Structures are given as structure tokens and as C-alpha cells.
């Protein structure tokens with residue numbers, strides 16, 4: 505339980521702040537006060553990444569459990585935690 509959550513807790517103030525901060529900045533007019541695979545994209549490449557529009561939907565579809573493809577202040581710190589071991 506709480507597999508990625510325990511990881512988002514070991515993050516650094518530079519990561520938690522950049523997340524919520526970049527989120528609100530990218531949530532401006534977002535689909536629903538959040539950043540779904542369609543909004544997180546431009547928000548992910550800015551954190552130091554460059555995935556594709558195809559793996560994006562599948563990425564959340566794996567961590568998400570509602571079938572919405574949205575990532576508010578929660579699935580963002582979780583989906584980014586898996587990318588830490590997906591490239592290592």
C-alpha cells in the first residue's frame with residue numbers, strides 16, 4: 505500500500521514546491537483545476553523529461569485507478585516517483 509506515496513515523502517522541498525508550483529501555473533484554465541496526460545505533458549518536459557503522447561496515457565492509466573487520465577496534486581508526485589526507477 506502507499507508504494508509511491510512513501511517515495512513522494514522522501515522528496516526534497518525543491519521537488520514538492522516545483523510540483524505544486526508548476527501545477528498551478530499549468531493548471532491555469534486546465535481541463536479541471538488539474539493537469540491530465542494532455543496537460544502534464546508540457547509540465548513533464550519542463551521538469552527534465554521528454555516522453556511521448558502515447559506512453560503518457562498508459563503511464564497514468566497504470567497508476568491512476570479511476571480511468572480519467574487526470575493528474576492533480578497527487579498522481580503527479582506518484583507518476584514522477586515511478587520514473588525514478590523506470591530509467592535507472
Ligand SMILES: [Ca+2]
Nearest residue numbers: 568572573574
Ligand atoms: Ca486520475
